Curated annotation (Swiss-Prot):
It comes from Homo sapiens. CDD domains: Porin3_VDAC (cd07306). GO terms for cellular component: extracellular exosome; membrane; membrane raft; mitochondrial membrane; mitochondrial nucleoid; mitochondrial outer membrane; mitochondrial permeability transition pore complex; mitochondrion. This is Non-selective voltage-gated ion channel VDAC1. The modification Phosphoserine is found at residues 13, 193, 240. GO terms for molecular function: ATP binding; ceramide binding; cholesterol binding; identical protein binding; oxysterol binding; phosphatidylcholine binding; porin activity; protein kinase binding. The lineage of its organism: Eukaryota, Metazoa, Chordata, Craniata, Vertebrata. The modification N-acetylalanine is found at residue 2. The modification Phosphothreonine is found at residues 19, 107.
Length: 285
């Protein structure tokens, strides 16, 4: 069943910053901790097999209850200072205040972005504004979720530049048989996605990318094999552009681990394949 939300899944940013490195096979570990008053602790650890460079991030969230404010601060990767504050209201709930603040002293800068979540009868409005970052930006993301129908739109307006950069549109529906997902970019970019289940404990997906400008289409096939909740196989492949496959398994006890592999043009086997491993432990005390 679709436990998580599907209306917001229709579209979302990744925030993949430009980074540089060297070496394959990357190991990652995520752990959760609790503190007095019910705090949220998140520890992330990354290490490389060949390369000799290990990093470790930490996150601390100080909260108390629903109606109130929570201060979450700590240290993020790239030697960055994390500091955000989110407060929620109980009486007549429907709005959420969130403020994300980060400061990078190591040859970096200070970034301040505020986010607000508003829930309506059947529509959600997200107000996001970037302040103190060399130009005040104001973007708004509106998402809707209906029984069988899904909608999602995101726009960004600039008060200092006075011109909307780009707008992302997403619309689709979930059927008892197949799933329809449509996504287009204001940049004349058409994107189609559909999900189809082959047989029991087996499901497939198909994706197609279209860019107004040439007769070249980017096709892609997704394979999902779920025979049990103990192990899930999820792989994604494109039109000879990129071939990736990821699978996760959980031992008898509380030991779950996810391992995947990346193959570029299915020709990296010669000596240049990529791999990603991520372990998640749960403190049961």
């Amino acid at each position: 069943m679709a436990v998580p939300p599907t209306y917001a899944d229709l579209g979302k940013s990744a925030r993949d910053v430009f980074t540089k490195g060297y070496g394959f096979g990357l190991i990652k570990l995520d752990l959760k901790t609790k503190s007095e008053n019910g705090l949220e602790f998140t520890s992330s650890g990354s290490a490389n097999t060949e390369t000799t460079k290990v990093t470790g991030s930490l996150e601390t969230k100080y909260r108390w209850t629903e109606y109130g404010l929570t201060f979450t601060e700590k240290w993020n990767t790239d030697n960055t200072l994390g500091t955000e504050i989110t407060v929620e209201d109980q009486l007549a709930r429907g709005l959420k205040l969130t403020f994300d603040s980060s400061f990078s002293p190591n040859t970096g800068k200070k970034n301040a972005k505020i986010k607000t979540g508003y829930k309506r009868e059947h529509i959600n409005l997200g107000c996001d504004m970037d302040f103190d970052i060399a130009g005040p930006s104001i973007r708004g993301a509106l998402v809707l979720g209906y029984e069988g129908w899904l909608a999602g739109y995101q726009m960004n307006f600039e008060t200092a530049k006075s011109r909307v950069t780009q707008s992302n549109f997403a619309v689709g529906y979930k059927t008892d048989e197949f799933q329809l997902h449509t996504n287009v970019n204001d940049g004349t970019e058409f994107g189609g996605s559909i999900y189809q289940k082959v047989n029991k404990k087996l499901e497939t997906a198909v994706n197609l990318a279209w860019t107004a400008g040439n007769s070249n289409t980017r096709f892609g096939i997704a394979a999902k094999y779920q025979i049990d909740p103990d192990a899930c196989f999820s792989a994604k492949v494109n039109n000879s552009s990129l071939i990736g496959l990821g699978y996760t398994q959980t031992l008898k006890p509380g030991i779950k681990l996810t391992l995947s592999a990346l193959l570029d043009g299915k020709n990296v086997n010669a000596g240049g394949h990529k791999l990603g491993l991520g372990l998640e432990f749960q403190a049961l005390e």
